[PDB]
């Protein structure tokens, strides 16, 4: 799911950027260090809203580093996974252990034990795919996956989903 | 089968906090603890010797009457009454035809409950629901 | 207090009574290897955005 | 792998790093063996 | 100051500590959690991208639209935009409401239920045909809205579906 | 080279909170359970799994990684173990504190001997600082030798107001060696018996939250029950490095010598109490375990023997390493 | 049959394996001999006692003795209690033999080396099925 | 921010202290050694410390000194407005 | 003694048998501190009740645990990894799960086929322990008075014609001492 949150970050500027347009550098550093990043507490930070109205506080010179630490308050769009949520995605990779479903900037891996008994791995087909009488699952296919578990690391998030429940799987 | 789960044999004595539940699909009793561990992942065959009908966790409910057989009649009555519902004014106060209609509606329920003609009765019920 | 005398005895009493140390003194900071709030450490030096833009 | 974890606290997103002399780290561990808990914290609980 | 020492679950509407119903913004004014559906998020993100492009400059079928977003994304975004590229591609290939008017109607439609921001967003993000599908796909809906209202809502939602 | 780049935020320490490990916490912090008093396997090639020098507790060799964090000697800070003692053992540095707390509260129900109904106590409970407040309570409570199930009402001394009590006469507690001995005054010579550590642990756990807060303890960071040691944390190898003179002879730190002794005494007690082991024999083993633990944390105990190595010199304890002009501080 | 847990110092820039490594103990650095890149810094070079894991194996024991201030009651009891250790009894027999063999060698004015050889021989040949019906004197005398 | 005393009620000394001067020169000198832009025309100087001293004399150091009070409150004094008389 | 020790010791740890120590003073010989063994029904009934519940609970937890996904194991370091944890360690090729310490392909864990076995074990336990549960129900209906060395002595049947142990209780007069667990309602 996509959320709008008010987040804060402690950005560090090298002394080489102490110039009249240092604020522009500060705004830049936010873009290439926040946008596209993954945080276990807020999820994938995708885009920053009101980029022209980012609140910048007074910077503090580090004792020995010589850089300045600025507390930046900004509004951004964050995609956070939660267990028990249902999302849609497209299969990108297939393997014996299971296939990975791409949902936004996150990849959900579905294990065989979480799949219906009917589906069976078929490595003879190129590309390898899971073949069932009702439907066939392969890369680029549309699958409705229910997130079964999520592990949030300081800089990475991985989740496991299932398609065994009713109204799941191929759409 | 007195005060304990038939599957896990959790009696009220050793677990006063446990609670019982039933599923309308097969009317098979199962405690809350068994339901979570067996059906949390998804639909599966009923954990009974001789039951192979798939069921969903969300369909579980709690018994109202102490008799299993009576529960079957009411459950079928609820679905039947949602379509077979006509008042006295529906026939302009003519009780002669209303009584016959009431008997026919009750007759359908009786046949369904005892499975006299499941195939034919179900088709007629399905056909009438559209109209 | 432990830095002067009876190091272990003082620390044991701190553990039992759950003493809170604010590390405002020189001795606390020396142990933790951080600037003490003395002399050149009794203040923080910040950036002057208003002055910095005008100096160009 | 850029992964942190504190067994017992079951957290992976609330980790901080501090720079202390190795003697300080040894002292705290020695106190830990003596059943004393030196708890290093960043945010102050109470005002001056 | 005691410090020392509920698992997150979408079904129970327990999103954790940082995603509580009551949120605090940068200005200190209390606000409700802002959750966006797939279509609303796409417009919100795309709205910011065009605004950023305008600032730098001063100082349709699915296929053609996808290319426009891809070229727009690269021009208005910096490096390491791999995650953004996947998001925009995913959003365009899974969006059901294209223009503001459709989304505006959607927002004006679902807010009548008074449901939680999480569950209401899910209803507008997942294509479900029957009330039972909505109940199982989003377990939070159980014992929250009668099937009569849910059935009508689903029918109306599918009515205003472009293409 | 220095430390490798990390992603966690860099922040300075602004506060230090002291306390005691709970038996639950020490088990959670630990990464491996120590059960064997040896340091090397029968082949003397690799460290034994589950021994004192367990690879999971860390590594002190430049050429060996830590099995837990998979980091070198200069990056692994060490990981703690834990030993489940057969019986609870007093903390050598808290026996004086334990004795004061025992006299303050009843030894049968864990309630303060003196309640708020006493004018003198009201003054004592009004003291802000814990240290002086604790001293005030001890001076008053130590002199009461009865639980006073019924206490006079504060409004007047005519009627008695019921108070939570049991009517059991409290004993006069004196410290003998590393054990607490309590004597009960009869209604000829007074009755005497040894207060078991298990009894002390049981009583301290009954003290109410409000009861021991009046004694200066913290409900969340330090409780009287946590003074009695049930699970002993094991410091990692860095705290007790293995030195070498010619690098062909392996030497062990003084702490490892005591840790091996503690485990050997611990295992011996478990086997004894498991089968047979009449009461006097077990008590001898219990005293041995208490002595080993106390000397491990402090080898300078008045009136008690000192642990001497085969070389005959006194064993260096953790207390000794911290105190003095050459200590850590 | 176990985890590797092995560290090898190789120069990323030179990529030569095995590498030429010089340990600058005076400067406390490990530096590649070809390019000079430092691979490890802060190199390391009474609190413990040495033991021989050839005559005693793995046996950590500490005696109990009088201190600067002690009562005979506590000292006597602990030694009495320490004696009744079931686990330590097995290794006491080996230590007892080491005591007797020393006395015999000491009374023979033999060099320390001879004593070391005899002590190790007894331990290696002790606790064997073949040496089960032979007097301990024969074992010790033969070992010497 | 109740701990930021308004500029109109600052009660601290308007003279730079010896400790303040030492850190300002050291802090600014450290930055210059990291190729920080110099805001003063140099007539020939290589030692960063000397360059920092020149900036302080001409009041061209873009730094603000945050003086901390014993109660946690603080006052912000610009380097330019601080009188360097010692 | 070496055979009575383990039996008494184990029957004492589980609290199925209580111990009582007292000073007995024979008139025509040196005295001795005697040890008497008895049963405290309220305590013994509680010990069995908790243990019966604990044994069933462990099987119930194991039955629930087995229903959870199997997981993975590493042959070399013998480290267990859950399904959620394994997903963050697979190789870039997205073909096999790679260990962190060993960097070697993982091997699926066992217990997949035990799902029926654990349920079967639980069924046997309840059926076998059925007599205990029925007895407890009847025990709950009635109220049992706590037993004491003196109270239990009322039903004594002397073992031997001339027993050196004097089966009598002689509490000391004016004894303010209270021992742990030596007092009963
Ligand atoms: Zn059950
Ligand atoms: Zn069934
Ligand atoms: Zn480590
Ligand atoms: Zn009492
Ligand atoms: Zn090189
Ligand atoms: Zn491995």
From Swiss-Prot, chain B:
A zinc finger (RING-type) spans 5-52. Transmembrane segments: none annotated. It is found in: Nucleus. Disulfide bonds: none annotated. Component of the transcription factor IIH (TFIIH) holo but not the TFIIH core complex. Component of a complex consisting of KIN28, CCL1 and TFB3; the KIN28-CCL1 dimer is known as the TFIIK complex. Acts as a component of the general transcription and DNA repair factor IIH (TFIIH or factor B), which is essential for both basal and activated transcription, and is involved in nucleotide excision repair (NER) of damaged DNA. TFIIH has CTD kinase and DNA-dependent ATPase activity, and is essential for polymerase II transcription in vitro. Present with 3050 molecules/cell in log phase SD medium. This is RNA polymerase II transcription factor B subunit 3. The gene is TFB3.
Swiss-Prot record, chain D:
Coiled coil: none annotated. Zn(2+) binds at residues 6, 9. It comes from the Eukaryota. It is found in: Nucleus. Component of the RNA polymerase II (Pol II) complex consisting of 12 subunits. The binding of ribonucleoside triphosphate to the RNA polymerase II transcribing complex probably involves a two-step mechanism. The initial binding seems to occur at the entry (E) site and involves a magnesium ion coordinated by three conserved aspartate residues of the two largest RNA Pol II subunits. Belongs to the RNA polymerase beta chain family. DNA-dependent RNA polymerase catalyzes the transcription of DNA into RNA using the four ribonucleoside triphosphates as substrates. Second largest component of RNA polymerases II which synthesizes mRNA precursors and many functional non-coding RNAs. Proposed to contribute to the polymerase catalytic activity and forms the polymerase active center together with the largest subunit. Pol II is the central component of the basal RNA polymerase II transcription machinery. This is DNA-directed RNA polymerase II subunit RPB2. It comes from Saccharomyces cerevisiae (strain ATCC 204508 / S288c). The chain holds residues 1177 to 1224 of 1224 of the full protein.
Swiss-Prot record, chain E:
GO terms for molecular function: nucleotide binding; translation initiation factor binding. It holds the Pfam family RNA_pol_Rpb4. The keyword Cytoplasm applies. It is found in: Nucleus; Cytoplasm; Cytoplasm, P-body. GO terms for cellular component: cytoplasm; nucleus; P-body; RNA polymerase II, core complex; RPB4-RPB7 complex. GO terms for biological process: DNA-templated transcription initiation; mRNA processing; nuclear-transcribed mRNA catabolic process, deadenylation-dependent decay; positive regulation of translational initiation; RNA-templated transcription; transcription by RNA polymerase II; transcription elongation by RNA polymerase II; transcription initiation at RNA polymerase II promoter. Keywords: Acetylation, Cytoplasm, DNA-directed RNA polymerase, mRNA processing, Nucleus, Phosphoprotein, Transcription. InterPro entries: HRDC-like_sf (IPR010997), RNA_pol_Rpb4/RPC9_core (IPR006590), Rpb4-like (IPR045222), Rpb4/RPC9 (IPR005574), Rpb4/RPC9_sf (IPR038324). Disulfide bonds: none annotated. Belongs to the eukaryotic RPB4 RNA polymerase subunit family. This is DNA-directed RNA polymerase II subunit RPB4. It comes from Saccharomyces cerevisiae (strain ATCC 204508 / S288c) (Baker's yeast). The lineage of its organism: Eukaryota, Fungi, Dikarya, Ascomycota, Saccharomycotina. The gene is RPB4.
Curated annotation (Swiss-Prot), chain G:
GO terms for molecular function: RNA polymerase II complex binding; RNA polymerase II complex recruiting activity; RNA polymerase II general transcription initiation factor activity; TBP-class protein binding; zinc ion binding. One of its GO terms (biological process) is transcriptional start site selection at RNA polymerase II promoter. Its main location: nucleus. Keywords: Metal-binding, Nucleus, Repeat, Transcription, Transcription regulation, Zinc, Zinc-finger. It comes from the Eukaryota. GO terms for cellular component: nucleus; transcription preinitiation complex. A zinc finger (TFIIB-type) spans 7-40. The keyword RNA-binding does not apply. Zn(2+) binds at residues 11, 14, 32, 35. It is found in: Nucleus. General factor that plays a major role in the activation of eukaryotic genes transcribed by RNA polymerase II. Belongs to the TFIIB family. Associates with TFIID-IIA (DA complex) to form TFIID-IIA-IIB (DAB-complex) which is then recognized by polymerase II. Present with 6750 molecules/cell in log phase SD medium. This is Transcription initiation factor IIB. It comes from Saccharomyces cerevisiae (strain ATCC 204508 / S288c). The lineage of its organism: Eukaryota, Fungi, Dikarya, Ascomycota, Saccharomycotina. The chain holds residues 14 to 176 of 345 of the full protein.
């Amino acid at each position: 799911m996509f959320f709008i949150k008010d987040l804060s970050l402690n950005i560090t500027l090298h002394p080489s950027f102490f110039g009249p347009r240092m604020k522009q550098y500060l705004k830049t550093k936010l873009l290439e260090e926040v946008e596209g990043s993954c945080t276990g507490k807020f999820g994938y930070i995708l885009c920053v809203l009101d980029y022209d109205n980012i609140d910048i506080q007074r910077g503090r010179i580090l004792p020995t580093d010589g850089s300045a630490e600025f507390n930046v308050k900004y509004r951004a769009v964050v995609f956070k996974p939660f267990k028990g949520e249902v999302v849609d995605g497209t299969v990108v990779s297939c393997s014996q252990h299971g296939f990975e479903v791409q949902v936004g900037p996150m990849k959900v891996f579905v294990t065989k034990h979480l799949m219906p008994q009917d589906l069976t791995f078929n490595a003879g087909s190129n590309p390898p795919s899971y073949q069932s009488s009702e439907d066939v699952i392969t890369i680029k296919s549309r699958i409705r996956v229910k997130i079964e578990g999520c592990i949030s690391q300081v800089s990475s998030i991985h989740a496991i989903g299932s398609i065994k429940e009713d109204y799941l799987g191929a759409i | 089968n007195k005060d304990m789960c038939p599957i896990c044999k959790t009696d009220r004595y050793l677990s006063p906090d446990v609670k019982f539940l039933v599923n309308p699909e097969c009317y098979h009793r199962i405690c809350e603890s068994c339901v979570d561990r067996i059906f949390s992942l998804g639909p599966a065959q009923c954990p009974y010797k001789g039951c192979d009908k798939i069921l969903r966790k969300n369909k579980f409910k709690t018994q109202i009457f102490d008799d299993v057989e009576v529960e079957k009649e009411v459950d079928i009555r609820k679905r039947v009454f949602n379509v077979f519902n006509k008042t006295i004014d529906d026939f302009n106060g003519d009780l002669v035809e209303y009584n016959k209609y009431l008997e026919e509606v009750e007759d359908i329920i009786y046949k369904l409950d005892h499975g006299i003609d499941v195939a034919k009765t179900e088709e007629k019920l399905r056909t009438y629901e559209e109209l | 207090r432990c830095s002067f005398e009876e190091t272990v005895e003082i620390l044991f009493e701190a553990g039992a009574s759950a003493e809170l140390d604010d590390c405002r003194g020189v001795s606390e900071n020396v142990i933790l290897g951080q600037m003490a709030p003395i002399g050149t450490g009794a203040f923080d030096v910040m950036i002057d955005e208003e002055s910095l833009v005008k100096y160009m | 792998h850029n992964q942190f974890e504190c067994k017992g606290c079951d957290n992976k997103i609330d980790i901080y790093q501090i720079h202390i002399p190795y003697a300080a780290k040894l002292l705290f561990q020695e106190l830990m063996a003596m059943n004393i808990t030196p708890r290093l914290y960043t945010d102050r609980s109470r005002d001056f | 100051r005691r410090r020392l020492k509920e698992e997150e679950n979408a079904a129970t509407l327990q999103l954790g500590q940082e995603f509580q119903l009551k949120q605090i913004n940068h200005q200190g004014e209390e606000e409700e959690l802002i959750a966006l559906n797939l279509s609303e998020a796409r417009l919100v993100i795309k709205e910011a991208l065009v605004e950023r492009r305008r600032a730098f400059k001063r100082s349709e079928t699915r296929e053609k639209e996808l290319e426009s977003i891809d070229v727009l994304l690269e021009q208005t975004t910096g490096g390491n935009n791999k995650d953004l590229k996947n998001t925009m591609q995913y959003l365009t290939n899974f969006s059901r409401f294209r223009d503001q008017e459709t989304v505006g109607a959607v927002i004006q439609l679902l807010k009548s239920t008074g449901l939680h921001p999480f569950e209401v967003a899910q209803l507008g993000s997942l294509a479900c045909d029957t009330a039972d599908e909505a109940k199982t796909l989003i377990p939070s809906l159980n014992n929250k809205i009668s099937d009569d209202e849910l059935e009508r809502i689903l029918k109306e939602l599918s009515n205003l579906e472009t293409l | 080279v220095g430390q490798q780049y990390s992603s966690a935020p860099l922040r300075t320490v602004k506060e230090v909170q002291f306390g005691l490990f709970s038996p639950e916490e020490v088990r959670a912090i630990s990464v491996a359970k120590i059960r064997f008093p040896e340091t090397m396997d029968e082949t003397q090639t690799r460290a034994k799994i589950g021994g004192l020098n367990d690879p999971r507790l860390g590594s002190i060799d430049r050429n060996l990684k830590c099995q837990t964090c998979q980091e070198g000697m200069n990056e692994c800070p060490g990981h703690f173990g834990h030993i489940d003692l057969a019986k609870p053992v007093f903390h050598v540095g808290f026996i004086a504190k334990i004795k004061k707390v025992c006299e303050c509260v009843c030894m049968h129900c864990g309630k303060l001997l003196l309640d708020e109904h006493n004018e003198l106590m009201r003054q004592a409970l009004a003291i802000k600082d814990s240290k002086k407040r604790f001293a005030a309570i001890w001076t008053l409570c130590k002199t009461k030798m009865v639980c006073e199930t019924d206490v006079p009402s504060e409004d007047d001394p005519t009627q008695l107001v019921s108070r939570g009590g049991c009517g059991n006469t409290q004993p006069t507690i004196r410290k003998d060696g590393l054990k607490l001995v309590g004597s009960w005054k009869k209604d000829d010579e007074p009755e005497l018996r040894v207060l078991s550590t298990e009894e002390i642990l049981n009583i301290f756990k009954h003290i109410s939250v409000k009861d021991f807060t009046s004694l200066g303890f913290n409900e969340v960071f330090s409780r009287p029950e946590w003074m009695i040691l049930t699970c002993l944390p094991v410091p990692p190898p860095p705290v007790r490095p293995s030195i070498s003179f010619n690098e062909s002879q392996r030497g062990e730190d003084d702490l490892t010598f005591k840790l091996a002794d503690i485990l050997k005494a611990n295992i011996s007690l478990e086997t004894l109490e498991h089968n047979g082991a009449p009461h006097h024999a077990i008590e001898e083993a219990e005293s041995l375990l208490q002595f080993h633990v106390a000397t491990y944390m402090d080898n300078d105990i008045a009136g008690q023997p000192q642990a001497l190595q085969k070389s005959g010199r006194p064993v260096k304890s953790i207390r000794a390493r911290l105190k003095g002009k050459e200590g850590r501080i | 049959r176990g985890p590797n847990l092995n560290i090898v110092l190789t120069c990323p820039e030179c990529k030569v394996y095995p590498p030429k490594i010089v340990e600058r103990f005076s400067e406390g650095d490990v530096v590649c001999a070809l390019c000079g890149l430092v691979l490890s810094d802060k190199l390391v070079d009474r609190v413990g006692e040495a033991s021989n894991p050839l005559l005693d194996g793995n046996n950590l024991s500490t005696r109990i003795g009088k201190g600067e201030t002690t009562d005979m009651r506590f000292t006597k009891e602990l030694n009495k209690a320490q004696g009744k250790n079931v686990m330590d009894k097995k290794d006491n027999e080996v230590q007892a033999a080491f005591a007797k063999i020393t006395m015999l060698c000491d009374a023979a004015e033999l060099p320390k080396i001879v004593k070391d050889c005899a002590k190790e021989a007894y331990k290696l040949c002790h606790d064997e099925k073949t040496l089960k019906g032979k007097s301990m004197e024969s074992i010790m005398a033969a070992s010497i | 921010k109740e701990k930021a005393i308004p500029k109109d009620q600052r009660a601290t000394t308007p003279y730079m202290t010896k400790y303040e001067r030492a850190r300002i020169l050291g802090t600014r000198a450290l930055q210059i050694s990291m190729n920080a832009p110099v805001f003063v025309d140099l007539e020939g100087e290589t030692d960063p410390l000397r360059i920092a001293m020149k900036e302080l004399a001409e009041k061209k150091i873009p730094l603000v000194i945050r003086r901390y009070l014993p109660d946690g409150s603080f006052e912000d004094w610009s380097v330019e407005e601080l009188i360097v008389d010692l | 003694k070496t055979e009575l020790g383990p039996l008494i010791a184990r029957l004492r740890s589980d609290r199925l048998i209580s111990i009582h120590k007292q000073r007995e003073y024979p008139p025509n010989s040196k005295s001795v501190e005697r040890v008497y063994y008895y049963v405290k029904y309220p305590h013994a009934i509680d010990a069995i009740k908790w243990k019966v519940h604990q044994v069933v609970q462990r099987l119930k937890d194991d039955l629930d645990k087995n229903s959870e996904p199997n997981g993975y194991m590493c042959p070399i370091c013998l480290t267990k990894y859950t399904q959620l944890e394994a997903v963050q360690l697979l190789n870039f090729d997205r073909t096999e799960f790679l260990c962190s310490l060993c960097d070697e392909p993982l091997v699926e864990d066992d217990s997949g086929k035990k799902n029926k076995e654990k349920q079967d074990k639980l069924n046997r336990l309840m059926d076998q322990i059925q007599p205990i549960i029925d007895s407890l129900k009847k025990i709950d209906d009635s109220r049992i008075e706590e037993n004491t060395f003196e109270i239990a002595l009322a039903r004594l049947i002397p073992p031997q014609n001339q027993s050196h142990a004097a089966y009598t209780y002689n509490p000391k007069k004016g004894s303010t001492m209270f021992r742990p667990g030596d007092s009963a309602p």
